[PDB]
Structure 1
Amino acid sequence: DPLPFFPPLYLGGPEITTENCEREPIHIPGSIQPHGALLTADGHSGEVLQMSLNAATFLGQEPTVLRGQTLAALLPEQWPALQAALPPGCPDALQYRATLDWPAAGHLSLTVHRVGELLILEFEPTEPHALRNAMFALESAPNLRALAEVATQTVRELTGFDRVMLYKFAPDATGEVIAEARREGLHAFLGHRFPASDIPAQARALYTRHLLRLTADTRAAAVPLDPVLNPQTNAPTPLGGAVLRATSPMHMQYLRNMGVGSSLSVSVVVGGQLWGLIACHHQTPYVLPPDLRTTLEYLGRLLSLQVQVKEALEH
């Protein structure tokens, strides 16, 4: 039965059990994963409102100094570019990316998107023809099976992940591993099916709009935003569009129990519906840098197109 979200934990909401899976408001956890930092800022003035508690250690500045400046002063070269790329009223799915040379922290990748009147800024550390070669190989795959196999093998070669599966949704939202590339010694998941509650209904809706999410370390504690609520609204900060957003503790316990230290998945979206997932596992924690993740994002789109094409060749 579909039911509306509970309030999050920090607003006195209940703790999540196998009973109330579908009602966890996973888009507003009030916290991020510790391998990057996040700031929120007023979309018109550029006043800095919220920051992750670890921000001082990524950005090399005291909180009170950060919060006491506008983005115009903090990001003089990027602030006008942000404002042109992310105009008021734009969708929350639109992202702008730049690379910064920050004194204390080396090269940072900056990813920005806009939710209403809020700008959300994510900072992460950042670092030949493999993509072009893959694009052509995907297109020349003769059928859906060969496409799925080429796609899994390519992603594994690009990333070094211990396991890369193509997980396909059935009409009842159960899922099946229809191809996989895996490290020697791992047991096969190929052909196994899994019940619809394994990926609940409100995570499926979010995966249709925001096409990549990850869990870099399944044992890492989440880092709170400070303050936790958006001071504009005294309400929760929407983090559905932020790759840094903390992962549901139910999902992390599920992955730890499988022996997974690192998870990543890309959405495959066909005709406006979530067709499947490029799902990746690593046994140890593992951070895939932003520019490599971009390659996977591009492959997500290519695969969406090629899945349509291969399936049309099939009636």
Structure 2
Amino acid sequence: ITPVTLANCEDEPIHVPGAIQPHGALVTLRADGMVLAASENIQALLGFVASPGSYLTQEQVGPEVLRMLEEGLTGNGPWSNSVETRIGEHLFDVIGHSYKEVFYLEFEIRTADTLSITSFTLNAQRIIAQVQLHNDTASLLSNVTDELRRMTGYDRVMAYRFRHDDSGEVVAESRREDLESYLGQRYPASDIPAQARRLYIQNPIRLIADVAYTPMRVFPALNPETNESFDLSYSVLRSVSPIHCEYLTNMGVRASMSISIVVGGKLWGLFSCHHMSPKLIPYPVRMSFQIFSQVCSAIVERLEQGRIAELLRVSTERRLALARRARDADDLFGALAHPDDGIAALIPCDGALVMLGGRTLSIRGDFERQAGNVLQRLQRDPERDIYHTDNWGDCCGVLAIRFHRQESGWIFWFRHEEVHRIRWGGKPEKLLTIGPSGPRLTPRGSFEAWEEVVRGHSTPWSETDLAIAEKLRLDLMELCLNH
């Protein structure tokens, strides 16, 4: 019965809302096919009253439907299927699935004049051609963002990237003129709490037909079998958190639809479609996006590792240049401090320090004091050959490696505090009408929430950045020992 406030919202059970969106009806069955619960609108949408204890009957739901249901009813492992069928006055999409051991049948009115197979195929071809045309991982995102809008007619579609700390960044955008831009927006991990994030990962597509909707409750609330709520995780019609709904209306959005990009076990980022009036996307089309989601995820994965590959390649090429020079010139300092192949170019940094013997070369600033303090901190830890941190002198980020012990051969890279890369301003943008929860649920409030998180922090060191440092360290050890 608990109200969901700003304090609660992190722990909101959004998977068991026990209600569904109004653009469809829902019937929940148990293993034997016996009805356990239904949305309060089954009668109003489909001509009949589903009742707990009942079993579904032909042409109160039609034949092919039970035909489908029986198949999944007798199959081990998460059944999933859909049928198209006429029930009374209308034809329906009857998407059905089984999660836990409860079976779900979802009913959407089908208004499309097209054959489903071809509608599905047509859109799949169109939206994944965008995945064959681009080598830049950012062109991919940018282009499919522009294309998703062309296909769906959404007012605004955005591509989010998710950082290491699960903070988001709007990296692409295609929007109707009128609308303010959110390009370069940054929001915290708390804007998409655990359960919501778990769900985007498990579900390629989420659709919100109308944010201003009144939910259609499924009765009864609790599954008699367990005396605990129905887990609508894989339910297409599952209802929305009032918090998110308030957020979206603060923005002035009325319909959403998001396509996930999952790589590893991580939500790599999603495409969020927003409409200013309510909007619906037919089932077969959503399936076009679902399959797309899986392929795009695959290509983004490769494109990303193709990116790291090239980073490693030019790094070694520079380690080669470095090895070449060092042996022939015989001062390392000159080699390391080289303007372009220098260490400052090896790994993205705002500065670097080279330190062998008693001599100190600070390149791109005065870093001698910091390096001294960092080194003192490592006093307590004589065995550390590598040190790094984004919390901390005057530079937040530090990556230090040791290549000579006795003569204190050290290398440092430094990073300043992370800064909002792109920022809007210039003319006060319009007044958002703000709900009861407060300004926290506006983009402006989200950004501020993000600042408070990152400030005091430099950008984390790449998986890649550390790998390079490690290779460099090996190089110099070799050199110093060798000659």
Q: TM-score, with normalisation over the residues of structure 2? A: 0.59
Whether the aligned pair in 1 keeps the contact of 2:157 and 2:174 (CA below 8 Å) is: yes
Whether the aligned pair in 2 keeps the contact of 1:43 and 1:114 (CA below 8 Å) is: no
Structure 1: give runs of 5+ residues left out of the alignment. Answer: 1-8
Distance 2:68 2:154 in 1: 35
Partner of 2:129: 136
Of 195, 200, 213, which aligns to 1:207?
200
- How far 1:198 moved relative to its partner? 0.7
The aligned runs of 1:212-227 (5 Å cut-off) are: 212-227=205-220
Partner of 1:306: 299
2:23 counterpart of 1:35: yes
Of 62, 65, 86, which aligns to 2:49?
62
Of 173, 194, 204, which aligns to 2:187?
194
Whether the aligned pair in 2 keeps the contact of 1:216 and 1:287 (CA below 8 Å) is: yes
SS of the residue corresponding to residue 120 of structure 1 reads strand
- How far 1:130 moved relative to its partner? 4.6
Partner of 2:395: none
The aligned runs of 1:273-292 (5 Å cut-off) are: 273-292=266-285
Equivalent position amino acid for 1:38 in 2: L
Distance 2:44 2:18 in 1: 19
2:250 counterpart of 1:262: no
- How far 1:61 moved relative to its partner? 1.6
Partner of 2:11: 23
C-alpha change, 1:41 and 1:130, in structure 2 (3 Å) is closer
The aligned runs of 1:52-201 (5 Å cut-off) are: 52-64=39-51, 67=52, 69-71=54-56, 73=58, 74-85=61-72, 87=74, 89-91=76-78, 95-104=80-89, 106-126=90-110, 127=112, 129-201=122-194
- How far 1:69 moved relative to its partner? 4.2
1:182-214 CA deviation, whole Å, 9 max, x = no partner?
111212111111111111122111221122212
Distance 1:27 1:130 in 2: 29
- How far 1:301 moved relative to its partner? 1.4
The aligned runs of 1:216-255 (5 Å cut-off) are: 216-255=209-248
Identity %: 39
Structure 2: give runs of 5+ residues left out of the alignment. Answer: 113-118, 309-483
Whether the aligned pair in 1 keeps the contact of 2:62 and 2:87 (CA below 8 Å) is: no
Partner of 1:6: none
Q: Which has the higher contact order (CA 8 A, sep 6+)?
A: 1
Whether the aligned pair in 1 keeps the contact of 2:261 and 2:270 (CA below 8 Å) is: yes
- How far 1:20 moved relative to its partner? 2.1
- How far 1:273 moved relative to its partner? 1.5
Aligned length: 297
Distance 1:72 1:56 in 2: 14
Whether the aligned pair in 2 keeps the contact of 1:89 and 1:116 (CA below 8 Å) is: no
- How far 1:87 moved relative to its partner? 4.8
SS of the residue corresponding to residue 233 of structure 1 reads coil
Distance 1:259 1:137 in 2: 30
Whether the aligned pair in 2 keeps the contact of 1:41 and 1:118 (CA below 8 Å) is: yes
Higher helix share: 2
- Using the TM superposition, name which of 154-163 and 73-82 deviates more: 73-82
- How far 1:170 moved relative to its partner? 0.5
- How far 1:137 moved relative to its partner? 3.2
1:282-312 CA deviation, whole Å, 9 max, x = no partner?
0011122212211221221121011012112
- How far 1:240 moved relative to its partner? 1.2
Whether the aligned pair in 2 keeps the contact of 1:32 and 1:246 (CA below 8 Å) is: yes
- Using the TM superposition, name which of 82-91 and 300-309 deviates more: 82-91
- How far 1:263 moved relative to its partner? 1.0
Distance 1:117 1:272 in 2: 25
